Design a protein around this ligand. Structure first.
Ligand SMILES: Nc1ccn(C[C@@H](CO)OCP(=O)(O)O)c(=O)n1
Length: 488
């Protein structure tokens, strides 16, 4: 009956209207910190450096554009003398610093994959150490780490240092992302748990506008990294005034701390009379009523349901974080493609919340996944000459993939039983990060063919859009209680 207590103290009061916004404000920067290897690691046009023994020194081909690997040995040799990058649009990036061109093309992908290898470990470690130390105690440490290892990478003199510090930044953000929602949904009432679940996805897709603005205001990569990883100091200085969630104190056993927190919340809300009316016996008599991750195995009815959902999660995340990168090659500047990839997410949700309720979950999911797969696969056929009909397919695929996220999140929840639903969505979201790890590794093979990555990104969602023909429909039904009554 804890919700009745929360309603007694005031329900949704000024305390919530302050702490909720102060905790959800630091998610305007996660979009910037995720898709940064588009403005901080761009690749400008480059050609070999002629020896200062003096124009006609480069074996140009393919419509006259100079080669990028040979230098006419005598007036067909590897460069070994540094390159001469252009400085008209990208004055400085990572690839300009450490010469990641024509022999070390895999290093950008290695950095982007090492940033995402340190989001899995983050979501694991800072999720295990959150319900054992405190939500606020972990928020403070993460707000600190994501700025003591995110501005010390903007001053790195080597490549491995940059890689390791980006890994640590990802490790911190992967704990901020969990603890935000976990702490935020515990001080709200029970009837407003879905109005705060669609606010961490409505302010999440506003970081892309901020990125398209900032990265255009500040082109250099060191200044950009520093200016994007600086405000976490301000977000950390005031991170001591947060109030710990009373439900965690209640679960841990210590009830006097819960009573103190509730009295403080009552004083803040302006209900001192009912706050002092609260006592120890009242709480002891009102809250006296108060799942293995391996049980998914050795149980066919659960394993058969887990495999399909894992495949759907993986395919969606893989296609998404394979498409949202490589904004170069559409004939239009990146500062205009970002503000179009981030402004097509409103219709992709207004239609997702209009097709699932009218037909179901299976048809909407399958349609979104297959249409995104086709729109992705069709770009690896049309030649790069077209530039008006080659970005529309990209924006359509991105919208369809966002709709796929928003539908699979609800479907996985409504599908599982009620006791294992907490550790089912966890194992389902974990498989949405192995996808983001293996997504940039595939883009390395673009050396073997100029379109094989685009073909790989197009076939996995299509091969996954045929898995939903094995899952039960769950529109207009009661949520299944146990594994026994889960039949149809
Ligand atoms: N758990 C999730 C869910 C969604 N997105 C992508 C995000 C920006 O496109 O989606 C915004 P929305 O689906 O409208 O909430 C993500 O990166 N991680």
């Amino acid at each position: 009956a804890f919700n009745d207590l929360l309603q007694q103290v005031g329900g949704v009061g000024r305390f919530q209207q302050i702490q909720v916004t102060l905790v959800v404000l630091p998610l305007l920067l996660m979009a910037s910190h995720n898709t940064l290897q588009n403005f901080t690691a761009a690749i400008p046009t480059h050609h070999c450096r002629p020896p200062a023994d003096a124009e006609v020194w480069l074996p140009r081909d393919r419509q006259g554009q100079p080669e990028s690997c040979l230098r006419f040995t005598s007036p067909t040799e590897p460069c070994t003398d540094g390159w001469i990058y252009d400085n008209s649009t990208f004055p400085s990036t990572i690839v300009t610093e450490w010469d990641l061109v024509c022999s070390h093309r895999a290093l950008r992908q290695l950095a982007q994959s090492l940033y995402m290898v340190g989001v899995l470990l983050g979501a694991m470690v800072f999720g295990y150490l959150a319900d054992r130390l405190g939500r606020r105690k972990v928020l403070i440490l993460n707000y600190l780490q994501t700025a003591v290892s995110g501005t010390c990478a903007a001053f790195a003199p080597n490549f491995p240092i940059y890689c390791a510090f980006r890994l640590l930044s990802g490790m911190a953000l992967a704990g901020i992302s969990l603890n935000c929602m976990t702490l935020n949904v515990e001080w709200m009432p029970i009837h407003t748990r879905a109005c705060v679940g669609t606010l961490i996805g409505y302010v999440y897709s506003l970081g892309q506008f901020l990125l398209a603005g900032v990265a255009y205001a500040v082109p250099h990569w060191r200044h950009l990294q520093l200016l994007v990883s600086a405000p976490f100091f301000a977000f950390f200085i005031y991170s001591w005034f947060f109030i710990e969630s009373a439900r965690w104190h209640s679960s841990s056993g210590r009830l006097d701390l819960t009573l103190r927190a509730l009295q403080r919340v009552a004083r803040i809300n302006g209900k001192r009379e009912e706050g002092a009316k609260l006592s120890m016996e009242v709480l002891r008599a009102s809250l006296q009523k108060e799942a293995s991750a391996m049980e998914l195995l050795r149980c066919p009815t659960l394993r058969h349901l887990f495999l399909c959902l894992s495949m759907l999660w993986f395919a969606t995340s893989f296609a998404y974080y394979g498409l949202v990168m490589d904004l170069q090659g559409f004939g239009v500047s990146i500062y205009l493609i970002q503000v179009i990839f981030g402004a097509v997410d409103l219709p992709a949700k207004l239609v997702g919340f209009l097709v699932i309720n009218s037909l179901g979950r299976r048809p909407a999911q399958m349609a979104a996944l297959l249409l995104a797969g086709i729109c992705i696969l069709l770009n690896g056929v049309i030649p790069q000459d077209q530039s008006i009909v080659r970005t529309s397919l990209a924006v359509l695929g991105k919208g369809c993939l966002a709709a796929s996220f928003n539908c699979i999140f609800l479907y996985t929840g409504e599908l599982y039983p009620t006791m294992i639903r907490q550790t089912g969505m966890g194992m389902g979201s974990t498989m949405a990060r192995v996808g983001s790890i293996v997504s940039p590794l595939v883009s390395m093979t673009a050396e073997l063919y100029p379109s094989m990555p685009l073909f790989i990104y197009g076939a996995v969602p299509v091969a996954a859009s045929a898995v939903t023909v094995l899952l039960p429909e769950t529109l207009g039904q009661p949520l299944p209680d146990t594994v026994q009554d889960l039949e149809s």
